[PDB]
Amino acid sequence: FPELYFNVDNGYLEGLVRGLKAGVLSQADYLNLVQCETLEDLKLHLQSTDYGNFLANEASPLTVSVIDDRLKEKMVVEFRHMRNHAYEPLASFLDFITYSYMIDNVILLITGTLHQRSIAELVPKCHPLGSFEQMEAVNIAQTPAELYNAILVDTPLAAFFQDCISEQDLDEMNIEIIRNTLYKAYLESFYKFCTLLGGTTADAMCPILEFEADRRAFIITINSFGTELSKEDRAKLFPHCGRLYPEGLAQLARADDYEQVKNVADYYPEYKLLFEGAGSNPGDKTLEDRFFEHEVKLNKLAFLNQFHFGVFYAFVKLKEQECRNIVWIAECIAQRHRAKIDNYIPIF
């Protein structure tokens, strides 16, 4: 029943985003990039795939940093083409994906605001997907983040700042805590919105958002051992969004040890067999080299569902895996350190 519509408004954008999926580099394409010896040879090998002639005009010395941003500028103009054509079941959905980059741009903007610097920080050092080229009051704000928070509510992140006291961000809360509290309220608001959309985009997306909350649950309670943040702080840094919510979030708040987050991960059979990264073994995939492969596995299963909006959010998270992989290929080649060049994530 929710499937014989959704070609009225979003029929053209489903085939367009699936046509972009066929250009994601496969296992055979990744083997050709490994055998390169120079970044000049990597430029000719990338000409066989969809990327071709994207590094034609840059320079004779090809640094790895100009490969990075030119890869990320291609996926921006691919995404910005799609957001201009979604009418309104999908334009507000595509706006939700850019809120993850709007959060990272806002916290980057409040730090220099506390240290008395302005617009020159904004234009070169912000993500183009969640950007500030509209709502021009936020650009002219050089005030010390109290007359600028009243400007910051003029921005679609205003619904997430209702747990953010304006004085509390003025150096009374740690700058990393103000990211993970914003990403917390972003995740339930994105989980609730995909639950209002019914049918295929409710069981192809909330399985991805359940694991994303439990990446946020596990990595917080492991990297908060040596540092002086209380257990009530990391308990409110946990998104109430996924499989660990009524039971596992209580046990992660009491951990104090890596072994105690391990046995509470063994209660969930999907989240165990991911905790075998085992960095005590000298050379092996670490815990977050196993969380990434489970992340792209759920995004790959999103394409098996057909009439749904989750094909768009999976496409951004897999095109971001391309810019992570090719840079990791190019940084092993430019440093001539290709003994761990196989540690990429082979999505397709």
Binding site: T63, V64, S65, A334, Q335
Partner: protein, 103 residues
């Protein structure tokens, strides 16, 4: 001299700031200088004059690829403090500059 200074490169300083050598007293200056593609040779030379005249700077780290431009400025510095070192870049490996003092 109690501080370590770094001129470095873009990827070099963010590794060394993670080591714990960065310090910002808002009166005088920052004790580092990120050198990007669009900064002039003069701006590297002023901050080199800043770190040599600063009292708290005891060590001056700099990549040798960046030190190849200000080489005329550091060949005249022949004092014991602050020490100037040339560290290798992500791309650029190594060799010159202190053995001018010893052949």
């Amino acid at each position: 001299g109690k501080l370590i200074a770094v001129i470095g490169d873009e990827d070099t300083v963010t590794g060394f700031l993670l080591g714990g050598i960065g310090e910002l007293n808002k009166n005088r200056h920052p004790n580092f200088l990120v050198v990007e593609k669009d900064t002039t040779i003069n701006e590297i030379e002023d901050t080199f004059r800043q770190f040599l005249n600063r009292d708290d700077i005891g060590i001056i780290l700099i990549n040798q690829y960046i030190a190849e431009m200000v080489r005329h400025a550091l060949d005249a510095h022949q004092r014991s403090i602050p020490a100037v070192l040339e560290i290798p870049s992500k791309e650029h490996p190594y060799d010159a500059a202190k053995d001018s003092i010893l052949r």
